[PDB]
């Protein structure tokens, strides 16, 4: 199937701190595999999945020294943005970046990414053409014009089409699954009128999933209640969805679970 690499980077200023904190987290197929954190006693990129310890010392030294460079890049950029928005001293400020590549199931490049947010809102992104930039704010046009003038997008296009794909292939080989949800229905005597049925899905991976209750053939948002999918903490995720249905008409309500590891969706009813 398809594959991806992403690094999610954060630079954070707060009114007390001397200089910002820089954190870089790399993902392969949406699973964290390296992490740099300037707050560590000896800041360095570190493996976060056992299959990455295959990389020898000079990989880590090289990547660590790059991260110290990006840390200074973020420091200057945060200082510049402060002025672009006429923000005074004494606040908390955040720069965030996501970058990486998506690969088809043929392992060829689908799309490259390079996006930034300031204060948690879109600041500037490289367009899918990998040649032009989009920037919403009037303040961000200053950055776009700087980056257009220096031809910066050319280096980024080269990364996204070259090293990003090439190193993702290396990683895919060195770390060369899914867990289907287990579902059950719980019964919750609620009021005189009716009961709630709670359709649980447990132990699944990845987190993308969908639960639906149908009264004998009709999906309903009629006060169907759910929770956001949540990590169990062991690598797998959880979700439930609940609905109220008159007593004695329980097995007229039936829950469906959609997850990509399933041979087909699960249909299930309440079981005493």
């Amino acid at each position: 199937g398809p594959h991806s690499m992403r690094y999610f980077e954060t630079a954070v200023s707060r009114p007390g701190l001397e200089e910002p904190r820089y954190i870089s987290v790399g993902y392969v197929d949406n699973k964290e595999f390296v992490r740099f954190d300037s707050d560590a006693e000896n800041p360095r990129y570190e493996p976060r999945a056992p299959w990455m310890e295959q990389e020898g010392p000079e990989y880590w030294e090289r990547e660590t020294q790059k991260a110290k460079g990006q840390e200074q890049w973020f420091r200057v950029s945060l200082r510049n943005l402060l002025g672009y928005y006429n923000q005074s001293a004494g606040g908390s400020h955040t720069l965030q970046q996501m970058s990486g590549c998506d690969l088809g199931s043929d392992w060829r490049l689908l799309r490259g990414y390079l996006q930034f947010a300031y204060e948690g809102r879109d600041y500037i992104a490289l367009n899918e053409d990998l040649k032009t930039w989009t920037a919403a704010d009037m303040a961000a046009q200053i950055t776009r014009r700087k980056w257009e003038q220096s031809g910066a997008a050319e280096h980024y296009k080269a990364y996204l089409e070259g090293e990003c794909v090439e190193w993702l292939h290396r990683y895919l080989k060195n770390g060369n699954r899914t867990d289907s949800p287990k579902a059950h229905v719980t019964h919750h005597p609620r009021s005189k009128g009716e009961v709630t049925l709670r359709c649980w899905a447990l132990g699944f991976y990845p987190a993308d999933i969908t639960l639906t209750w149908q009264l004998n053939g009709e999906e309903l948002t009629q006060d169907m209640e759910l929770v956001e999918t949540r990590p169990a903490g062991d690598g797998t995720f959880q979700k439930w969805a609940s609905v109220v249905v008159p007593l004695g008409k329980e097995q007229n309500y039936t829950c469906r679970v959609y997850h990509e590891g399933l041979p087909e969706p699960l249909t299930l009813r309440w079981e005493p």
Binding site: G69, Q70, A152, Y156
Partner: peptide
């Protein structure tokens, strides 16, 4: 391997 930004914002 992470992207290397060049020019500052």
């Amino acid at each position: 391997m992470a992207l290397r930004m060049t020019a500052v914002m």
